[PDB]
Amino acid sequence: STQVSSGQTYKITNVKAGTVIDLSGEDNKSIIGYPYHSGKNQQWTFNWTGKAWTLRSASSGSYLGIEGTPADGTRLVAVNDPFEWHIWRDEANENAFRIFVPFTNYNLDLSGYGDTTPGTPVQLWWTWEGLHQTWTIDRP
């Protein structure tokens, strides 16, 4: 298995679609599912703050975050300040993870039930059984 460790850099793969969390090359702001090609924009440095994880883009230095109130369809975007996430192992595949905004029922969700089309938006959604809300955290 692969340990998630503070200071280390990973790709984050959707279990259903096989695409990765990608900071879009078009705007360096939007977060999308894209096939892995070893881009630094597809690589995320995990820090433990003492209570949560922050995820920093290896290419831009922005953090993985959101703007505004968590809801179904809230878009993931690059943000300036570190944004804190909690990770929980998944029940269907225990080597995979669900990734939550702390103190909520909102987890990362690859949109359209895990559409494999490159460019598909990564968003928040209320937690439920779809495999497109589960992720592996892999060596780059």
Side-chain angles (χ1 to χ4, degrees):
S1 54
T2 297
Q3 190 187 351
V4 185
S5 298
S6 190
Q8 303 267 99
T9 298
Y10 304 89
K11 61 178 185 187
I12 305 170
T13 304
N14 191 260
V15 166
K16 183 170 188 205
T19 56
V20 308
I21 300 189
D22 177 298
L23 183 53
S24 176
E26 294 176 32
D27 64 6
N28 303 315
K29 175 92 164 151
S30 307
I31 304 297
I32 60 177
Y34 209 90
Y36 192 60
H37 61 85
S38 296
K40 281 315 149 96
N41 69 312
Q42 301 186 308
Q43 290 165 182
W44 296 97
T45 302
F46 279 59
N47 189 45
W48 182 244
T49 59
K51 64 195 191 285
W53 292 100
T54 64
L55 279 55
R56 199 184 196 187
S57 171
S59 62
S60 79
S62 291
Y63 292 83
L64 186 71
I66 62 171
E67 306 169 286
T69 305
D72 280 355
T74 295
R75 288 288 173 86
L76 269 82
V77 289
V79 303
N80 285 347
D81 295 328
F83 182 101
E84 292 191 311
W85 297 99
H86 288 169
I87 69 174
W88 293 90
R89 89 179 188 268
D90 188 54
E91 192 170 17
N93 303 104
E94 294 185 52
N95 52 299
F97 291 101
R98 291 172 175 265
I99 300 169
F100 284 87
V101 179
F103 313 109
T104 80
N105 300 336
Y106 293 100
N107 63 11
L108 274 55
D109 176 295
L110 181 62
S111 62
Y113 307 84
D115 199 333
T116 60
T117 306
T120 293
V122 176
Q123 70 195 337
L124 297 182
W125 205 265
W126 200 264
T127 205
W128 68 278
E129 338 84 55
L131 289 191
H132 61 286
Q133 305 194 331
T134 69
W135 309 86
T136 57
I137 297 165
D138 309 299
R139 295 294 169 191

